[model samples]
Target: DKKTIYFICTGNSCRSQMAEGWGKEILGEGWNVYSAGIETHGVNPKAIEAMKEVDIDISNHTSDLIDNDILKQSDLVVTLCSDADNNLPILPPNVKKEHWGFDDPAGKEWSEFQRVRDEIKLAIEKFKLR
Candidate 1:
């Protein structure tokens, strides 16, 4: 079976969405990648812009609340926001959970969004190497 990775955030707007996009692009088809939030806040437009700058389109992904079914099947859960990290649901002992905190870029400038976008890409790349 393929390895499954679930990325989580408080809002699933920016950081988690971008992380999922990077994971999908970098990890190819070998892994099952998904992103969700504790509460759906919809995808951020700035996130879309920043990702497009890197040629990764994430506009097709909707902001989703974490699904219990997916959680049960996930081999790894990566939390990009602190709230999601601190309040994550219980998981099987075999499932790994990792926190990669990134500042919320919701009301920030375009440069900041792009910076966070790049940071998320680097973080995802590092995680992929593990």
Candidate 2:
């Protein structure tokens, strides 16, 4: 079985979604990257666009509530936005948790959103090298 790294956010639209894609891309074939949200409002168009720019194409991932089974199986829990940590009590225990404070870019201005997208890309690359 592959070790899964789960990314969580408030809406599963921007930062967490982006991190999931990059984890799959940069990590190549050895790992699994899953993403979910505290709430399932659906995927964000801006998030899709940002990923498309990098040729990641995460438009297929929906905003889903984290599965309890998945939480039990995951190797790490990556909270990509503040809301995820602020509401951490909602998630389960027994998984290693790490926080990466990222700005939500879903409803922001276009320039700011793109900047965020690029930042996430860079951040993933940094994580990859570590």
Candidate 3:
């Protein structure tokens, strides 16, 4: 059985999107990867450029909100926010759960955008399969 990894965050804009892209790139062809927010919103443009910088090209990812059915279907749901970690919806007893506390990159100042972008990139790099 293939493992499915869903990356979750408040908005499907930056952090979780990057992780989804990076996870697919490193995990290669077998694993299924997806990203969803507690709520959907536009994908941040800066995130597109940031991923491009690393040749990951996340330009096509769209923000999506999690639906009750998706949550039930996923094999593992990984929350990427500290706050969401505590308030996540109840899951089926067999579903795996994990948390990756990533800082919010979209809230950074213009001067700090790249810094936050770099931080996200580094975090995803660390998430790469080894």
Candidate 4:
């Protein structure tokens, strides 16, 4: 059975969106990956541009709120910011939860986007595929 991985952040804007993009690209065959936020801020254009630098496209992703059904289905839920980590709804005990704590990259420089992008890449690389 494929495990579902959910990435989350404050706005579903940059960090979580990028992580979801990387997860889909890197762990595509073995895992089901999705992303959402505590609140919608729409997908970040800079995030799209940053991922484009690595040849991954996330232009179709939209900022979304965490769905209870998706949360229940997810085998792993990863929060990319403190806001999300602190605000998440109650989840099942069997569902693993992780916090990555990245700074919001909105309105920051391209370099900042790249930095968080690199960090997300590294983090996703560490999620072992089943």
RMSD of 3: 2.5
Would you estimate the TM-scores of all the predictions? Answer: 0.94, 0.86, 0.81, 0.93
lDDT of 4 at 53: 93
Clash count, one per candidate = 0, 0, 0, 0
lDDT of 2 at 94: 57
Per-residue lDDT tens digits of candidate 1, residues 22-51?
999987667899999888888888888888
Better of 3 and 4 by lDDT: 4
Candidate 4 overall Cα lDDT vs. reference? 0.86
The candidate, 1 or 2, that scores higher on TM-score is: 1
Candidate 2, 32-113: lDDT as tens digits? 8888887877777887887887798787887878778887878788888877877655545657888877776665788887
Clashing pairs in 1: none
For 23-128, candidate 3 gives per-residue lDDT tens digits of 7786646568888887777788887877787788888788988777767878778887766566567788877888867667676775465665566556656655
Instruction: Give the distance in Å from residue 40's predicted Cα in candidate 4 to where it truly belongs.
Output: 0.4
The 10-residue segment of model 1 with minimum total lDDT is 81-90
Candidate No. with top TM-score: 1
The whole-model lDDT of each prediction reads 0.87, 0.78, 0.75, 0.86
TM-score ranking, best first: 1, 4, 2, 3
Q: Model 2 off-target regions past 4 Å?
A: 89-94
The stretch of ten residues in a row with the least summed lDDT in candidate 2 is 86-95
